[PDB]
């Protein structure tokens with residue numbers, strides 16, 4: 001009785017950047033974005049395709065069902081997670097991402113969306129520091145002051161709630177920063193990137209950065225609140 | 241009886257860098273090298289695998305037979321070229337490359353090796369400027385002081401020997417640097433790289449650089465000395481064999497800046513018809529659109545273009561050509577769609593504008609984006625091809641900026657002279673520094689794909705239509721596309737320098753080359769420059785127009801000035817240069833059509849073997865005439881301003897005013913007991929190996945011919 005998806009993925013052409021959102025595993029979406037040049041195909045990934053456990057029969061790859069330029073809003077549902085493409089500001093469009101969970105009582109809860117209030121930097125920011133095509137990436141997502149962040153690897157901070165902390169993604173003795181975290185809102189998030197960077201768990205914005213990359217890749221999975229054993233069931237099905 | 245190779249390739253592991261050397265085509269080796277990270281496989285290559293013609297049955301790919309760390313020397317032979325891996329200094333190893341040719345007499349000759357004397361930088365130098373893995377590359381090869389370099393693309397330098405010159409690989413108006421050259425030592429070299437960089441043809445070292453890349457790739461091919469026709473046969477087999485041109489394109493091409501509305505074009509065809517003067521193609525220049533990026537004629541001045549093209553073909557039978565620029569402005573009807581679908585290049589920060597023109601800042605469309613190439617053809621086929629204009633003038637597509645070596649085009653010369661840095665823009669295939677040299681090549685490809693799609697024809701087969709391009713790159717000869725020398729000044733010195741540019745293009749592999757008859761721009765320091773009403777420029781134009789008769793394509797064009805005007809711009813028609821000059825101009829138009837069999841025959845041999853159409857003197861008389869070797873090294877006027885147009889004609893334009901005698905050097909052919917050179921206008925025969933002063937009135941261009949005239953007019957010359 002699983003709410004299987006009706007689309008293999010959505011590919012948005014937003015100017016020079018392409019965003020490929022695909023249903024991935026149970027109650028999960030996989031988002032990939034790149035400016036100008038398509039993925040080489042030799043990028044390093046830490047997630048399984050298809051997931052170790054999920055609704056799928058075969059791997060997704062780059063497959064998608066619908067292509068748009070993001071002029072109009074769209075909606076895609078997989079399991080209990082729903083994606084809603086929207087505009088920025090008062091506009092009605094479909095180049096901004098937002099993720100909801102369908103609760104047991106029929107209502108919906110906003111897990112997170114791309115941090116794009118009226119006056120703010122682009123939630124998918126690209127910057128070219130070198131003469132080549134490799135770029136640095138800064139992706140921003142909304143957050144609430146009451147949110148709680150669990151995981152993010154190991155660190156001697158004497159805290160299990162990582163909210164309000166910045167975690168640099170550079171390894172050294174006793175410090176293994178890993179961008180895999182659970183939120184008490186009922187969702188988990190995987191920044192599937194091997195590049196060094198930064199984890200910002202701010203009061204109103206969650207931001208991940210990549211020092212140098214050719215492709216941004218993350219996965220978001222939803223679960224009913226308080227049910228952390230399912231979140232870990234989904235994370236392990238994605239990463240091992 | 242070809243000396244086939246015994247190994248599919250050698251892969252050397254020299255520290256963190258991998259070098260893959262493979263036999264490639266006849267008498268050729270292909271070398272690829274990369275540090276740390278293996279090739280993505282999506283690098284841009286301009287050579288064919290397998291070569292169009294060679295010993296191979298299938299493509300090589302990354303295949304190799306032997307793997308080593310280069311501790312010991314090895315040897316590999318393919319055809320008459322031999323590779324010998326050696327050490328550096330007195331060491332005995334196998335991580336340095338050296339290339340020899342096996343001569344006919346059994347001996348060997350060193351073509352070149354990696355420049356690695358005892359004290360020197362690494363001949364394969366890598367440098368990482370950014371935080372990522374992309375690197376800059378500097379590859380150095382040995383050279384001798386006596387060496388001669390031919391090719392390297394086009395440039396207004398008045399030289400065919402490029403030795404001692406540095407050639408920057410950045411495109412702008414009249415400057416198409418292309419790293420394909422022949423050496424008089426008997427070898428050719430292709431730097432198969434789309435990145436911007438540098439060509440150093442120094443006294444003792446040849447060096448190529450790449451600003452940003454993930455893989456170095458070059459090909460070296462050997463040939464017996466003096467045998468340049470084989471070198472061009474190998475280069476064309478590696479980078480492309482030209483198609484056969486449509487017969488109409490070999491005629492008289494009328495153009496100017498500019499025919500402004502439809503009725504002016506229709507009266508032009510009426511004039512050719514009423515005067516019974518033949519014309520094969522009528523060209524419409526730029527600024528004929530409503531907005532930059534509309535890619536359609538402005539209906540306010542071209543109301544019914546299907547009727548215009550049909551009327552032109554009804555009066556003269558001529559085809560039509562229209563101009564398009566790669567720039568897109570915000571006022572364009574296509575601007576929103578081009579922006580939304582990511583079909584525009586952009587500077588990597590700021591608004592994204594790449595240059596300016598027509599009082600607006602613009603963005604160039606992305607010719608490297610396949611979707612953008614389709615978008616642009618959908619416009620050209622809708623508004624031109626399906627309306628009788630089936631030939632296209634792809635102007636100002638050098639890449640990066642809008643066709644010039646300065647930014648802020650169209651503005652004051654003071655502002656243009658301010659050293660604003662040329663833009664390292666974002667493309668779909670890379671950046672300007674990493675893949676920029678691809679832009680004009682992919683722009684030609686956009687129309688080639690459209691031409692071949694409409695006619696259901698394969699690339700390389702006979703062309704139905706052509707395109708006129710001002711830039712290109714390695715293997716551009718594979719397209720139904722002709723290159724012209726760009727914006728030149730209408731003075732005497734310019735006419736002399738254009739010859740050497742076309743001869744350098746021939747050594748690069750480009751046969752479809754031409755100029756603007758009479759120059760393009762007015763020289764402000766020469767009062768009569770470009771004035772069709774002054775006798776001074778009338779003399780220059782008739783000399784220039786006569787030369788275009790003996791070029792791969794005869795086309796007149798320019799931005800003239802005048803004392804009397806009856807149109808949007810000053811005229812450039814065969815009857816616009818004085819009553820006394822009209823019969824002179826029309827005679828060369830008729831002579832051009834009389835040479836049709838000769839033209840179609842020599843264009844066919846260029847299609848089969850890469851047989852150069854306009855030929856520098858070293859290709860036919862280096863084996864014979866001993867004095868030609870030095871006349872090329874010194875860049876004498878006898879070799880930079882004379883050439884063989886086909887196998888039988890020897891042409892030498894008059895590049896000075898007020899001249900009735902012209903000194904032409906007739907090369908030696910190998911038979912001292914004969915007089916093989918026949919002057920065209922007097923039918924007098926001369927012996928080879930001397931300079932002769934022939935009668936050169938204003939109506940006669942100095943031209944000699946081998947064999948009988950009636951045979952060369954028949955076409956049976958091969």
Ligand SMILES: *[C@@H]1O[C@H](CO)[C@@H](O[C@@H]2O[C@H](CO)[C@@H](O[C@@H]3O[C@H](CO[C@H]4O[C@H](CO[C@H]5O[C@H](CO)[C@@H](O)[C@H](O)[C@@H]5O[C@H]5O[C@H](CO)[C@@H](O)[C@H](O)[C@@H]5O)[C@@H](O)[C@H](O[C@H]5O[C@H](CO)[C@@H](O)[C@H](O)[C@@H]5O)[C@@H]4O)[C@@H](O)[C@H](O[C@H]4O[C@H](CO)[C@@H](O)[C@H](O)[C@@H]4O[C@H]4O[C@H](CO)[C@@H](O)[C@H](O)[C@@H]4O[C@H]4O[C@H](CO)[C@@H](O)[C@H](O)[C@@H]4O)[C@@H]3O)[C@H](O)[C@H]2NC(C)=O)[C@H](O)[C@H]1NC(C)=O
Pocket residue numbers: 084089100108109110113114115116117118142145
């Ligand atoms: C004391 O201090 C306190 C702070 O410490 C302070 O609290 C702050 O108060 C303000 C106002 O009270 C709060 O601001 C609001 O925040 C809301 C939540 O925002 C987030 O989530 C939404 C998505 O929300 C949808 O789904 C959830 C869950 O399912 C629902 O609960 C929601 O109702 C909503 O549902 C709709 O849309 C869904 C999807 O389409 C549908 O499924 C569903 O059916 C509903 O139609 C995100 O969009 C937000 O993202 C935005 O901001 C983030 C981060 O900044 C950006 O990253 C992102 O890009 C976006 O910009 C966000 O994540 C907002 O929903 C709420 O928005 C309303 O008002 C603002 C003006 O302030 C409007 O601009 C906005 O359009 C919203 O207006 C509509 O609804 C209002 C009333 O509800 C109507 O009056 C109005 O007409 C309009 O109607 C629209 O929808 C109607 C629904 O039917 C429809 O009828 C109409 O026709 C029309 O379309 C607002 O921003 C803020 O969060 C508090 N902060 C904190 C920390 O608590 C407090 O006020 C102080 N007290 C005092 C006395 O001073």
Ligand SMILES: *[C@@H]1O[C@H](CO)[C@@H](O[C@@H]2O[C@H](CO)[C@@H](O[C@@H]3O[C@H](CO[C@H]4O[C@H](CO[C@H]5O[C@H](CO)[C@@H](O)[C@H](O)[C@@H]5O[C@H]5O[C@H](CO)[C@@H](O)[C@H](O)[C@@H]5O)[C@@H](O)[C@H](O[C@H]5O[C@H](CO)[C@@H](O)[C@H](O)[C@@H]5O)[C@@H]4O)[C@@H](O)[C@H](O[C@H]4O[C@H](CO)[C@@H](O)[C@H](O)[C@@H]4O[C@H]4O[C@H](CO)[C@@H](O)[C@H](O)[C@@H]4O[C@H]4O[C@H](CO)[C@@H](O)[C@H](O)[C@@H]4O)[C@@H]3O)[C@H](O)[C@H]2NC(C)=O)[C@H](O)[C@H]1NC(C)=O
Pocket residue numbers: 324329340348349350353354355356357358382385
């Ligand atoms: C006036 O001013 C003039 C300048 O304006 C000035 O002229 C300069 O003079 C000097 C000396 O006269 C010249 O220097 C020489 O250059 C030679 C050519 O160098 C290039 O090519 C070689 C490869 O050459 C091979 O193949 C060709 C063609 O097939 C043959 O002709 C060669 O003989 C040679 O063949 C051998 O090896 C082949 C492959 O294995 C075999 O197939 C073949 O059978 C042969 O065995 C390249 O290697 C060179 O590359 C090097 O330098 C470049 C550029 O700098 C680097 O990029 C690269 O990394 C290399 O470092 C180069 O491209 C050289 O061959 C010659 O070398 C000899 O002497 C030097 C010392 O100076 C030794 O270090 C070197 O090892 C050589 O020595 C051997 O041979 C000599 C005599 O021939 C012996 O005495 C010695 O024992 C040694 O013997 C070796 O081989 C013997 C062969 O049998 C063997 O018997 C022995 O057992 C032993 O193994 C030298 O460098 C220079 O070019 C002139 N410059 C100009 C512009 O002309 C002039 O002198 C001035 N006059 C006066 C009076 O002052």
Ligand SMILES: *[C@@H]1O[C@H](CO)[C@@H](O[C@@H]2O[C@H](CO)[C@@H](O[C@@H]3O[C@H](CO[C@H]4O[C@H](CO[C@H]5O[C@H](CO)[C@@H](O)[C@H](O)[C@@H]5O)[C@@H](O)[C@H](O[C@H]5O[C@H](CO)[C@@H](O)[C@H](O)[C@@H]5O)[C@@H]4O)[C@@H](O)[C@H](O[C@H]4O[C@H](CO)[C@@H](O)[C@H](O)[C@@H]4O[C@H]4O[C@H](CO)[C@@H](O)[C@H](O)[C@@H]4O[C@H]4O[C@H](CO)[C@@H](O)[C@H](O)[C@@H]4O)[C@@H]3O)[C@H](O)[C@H]2NC(C)=O)[C@H](O)[C@H]1NC(C)=O
Pocket residue numbers: 500501502503527528529530531538540541542543598599807808
């Ligand atoms: C950036 O680039 C853009 C383009 O890429 C640049 O834009 C262009 O600039 C060029 C010139 O710089 C312009 O050419 C001029 O265009 C005008 C306008 O022509 C049009 O509009 C006319 C009238 O329109 C009005 O009425 C109509 C009624 O329907 C109405 O709809 C409309 O709303 C408006 O109210 C039309 O009549 C005219 O159409 C006619 O001709 C067409 C041609 O074949 C034909 O199709 C039509 O059937 C119709 O017959 C057209 O749509 C032209 O007027 C102008 O031409 C004059 O000047 C040029 C020299 O520039 C000259 O060669 C011409 O002969 C002509 O000259 C007459 O008037 C002169 C007075 O100025 C006079 O001196 C001349 O003698 C001549 O007049 C008289 O005598 C002669 C002979 O004795 C006789 O032939 C005449 O009939 C007359 O009796 C140019 O073509 C482009 O239009 C313009 N393009 C765009 C899109 O804007 C831009 O400048 C650049 N910007 C920057 C910053 O660099």
Ligand SMILES: *[C@@H]1O[C@H](CO)[C@@H](O[C@@H]2O[C@H](CO)[C@@H](O[C@@H]3O[C@H](CO[C@H]4O[C@H](CO)[C@@H](O)[C@H](O)[C@@H]4O)[C@@H](O)[C@H](O[C@H]4O[C@H](CO)[C@@H](O)[C@H](O)[C@@H]4O[C@H]4O[C@H](CO)[C@@H](O)[C@H](O)[C@@H]4O)[C@@H]3O)[C@H](O)[C@H]2NC(C)=O)[C@H](O)[C@H]1NC(C)=O
Pocket residue numbers: 500501502503504507803804805806807808
């Ligand atoms: C679409 O395209 C067509 C074709 O180009 C175009 O038609 C033509 O426009 C041009 C330019 O506007 C016209 O040329 C002008 O005609 C006028 C008047 O010509 C008449 O009278 C003469 C007398 O002999 C007849 O021969 C002729 O047939 C006409 O009936 C001329 O006055 C114009 O010339 C002058 O100015 C020029 C500079 O712009 C000077 O170089 C030239 O010397 C002329 O100037 C001086 O002349 C006199 C000196 O003695 C004196 O009057 C002044 O000092 C003056 O400065 C020019 O020749 C041409 O006739 C049009 N042709 C046709 C068939 O109509 C359309 O207009 C165009 N449509 C568009 C753009 O919408």
Ligand SMILES: OC[C@H]1O[C@@H](O[C@H]2[C@@H](OC[C@H]3O[C@@H](O[C@H]4[C@H](O)[C@@H](O)[C@H](O)O[C@@H]4CO)[C@H](O)[C@@H](O)[C@@H]3O[C@@H]3O[C@H](CO)[C@@H](O)[C@H](O)[C@H]3O)OC[C@@H](O)[C@@H]2O)[C@H](O)[C@@H](O)[C@H]1O
Pocket residue numbers: 497642643644649650651652653761762764799800801
């Ligand atoms: O560049 C804008 C700037 O031009 C100033 O002109 C200077 C410039 O001329 C180049 C220009 O010549 C046109 O022909 C002119 C000729 O220059 C004049 O001498 C003559 O009297 O008139 C003719 C035609 O009216 C050509 O038609 C133009 O193509 C050429 O311009 C170049 O245009 C190409 C594209 O077509 C573009 O890519 C180049 O960037 C551009 O330079 O240079 C020579 C100087 O002597 C001139 O002064 C002008 O004064 C100024 O107002 C401004 O318009």
Ligand SMILES: OC[C@H]1O[C@@H](O[C@H]2[C@H](O)[C@@H](O)[C@H](O[C@H]3[C@H](O)[C@@H](O)[C@H](O)O[C@@H]3CO)O[C@@H]2CO[C@H]2OC[C@@H](O)[C@H](O)[C@H]2O)[C@H](O)[C@@H](O)[C@@H]1O
Pocket residue numbers: 767773774775
């Ligand atoms: O020769 C050296 C000197 O030449 C100057 O040019 C002269 C020409 O020598 C002369 O042929 C020319 O003749 C024009 C005549 O002006 C015109 O009325 C007629 O219709 O056409 C004739 C041939 O085309 O005059 C020019 C002068 O040109 C201009 O600049 C000077 C100014 O005084 C005049 O009014 C202008 O026309 C060169 O100018 C000068 O640089 C040379 O050193």
Ligand SMILES: *[C@@H]1O[C@H](CO)[C@@H](O)[C@H](O)[C@H]1NC(C)=O
Pocket residue numbers: 006007074075076077
């Ligand atoms: C799939 O379902 C979504 C609702 O979540 C709907 O918006 C979309 O149109 C549907 N697509 C198809 C092909 O049924």
Ligand SMILES: *[C@@H]1O[C@H](CO)[C@@H](O)[C@H](O)[C@H]1NC(C)=O
Pocket residue numbers: 246247314315316317
């Ligand atoms: C191939 O021939 C070369 C000589 O050029 C020799 O060095 C090599 O050992 C040969 N390899 C094989 C497999 O015969």
Ligand SMILES: *[C@@H]1O[C@H](CO)[C@@H](O)[C@H](O)[C@H]1NC(C)=O
Pocket residue numbers: 554555
């Ligand atoms: C072209 O059509 C015209 C009628 O407009 C006719 O008089 C003429 O004979 C035709 N010529 C050709 C070559 O078809």
Ligand SMILES: *[C@@H]1O[C@H](CO)[C@@H](O)[C@H](O)[C@H]1NC(C)=O
Pocket residue numbers: 693694695696697
């Ligand atoms: C050429 O491309 C068109 C689409 O633009 C396609 O329909 C057609 O099959 C292709 N081939 C030919 C011969 O038209």
Ligand SMILES: *[C@@H]1O[C@H](CO)[C@@H](O)[C@H](O)[C@H]1NC(C)=O
Pocket residue numbers: 920921922923949950
């Ligand atoms: C030269 O010979 C050709 C024929 O080959 C002839 O047409 C021409 O008139 C001759 N020129 C003379 C006699 O000056």
Ligand SMILES: O[C@@H]1[C@@H](O)[C@@H](O)OC[C@H]1O
Pocket residue numbers: 496497525526635636710726727760797
């Ligand atoms: O041929 C010219 C071209 O080189 C450029 O200047 O655009 C205008 C054309 O007339």
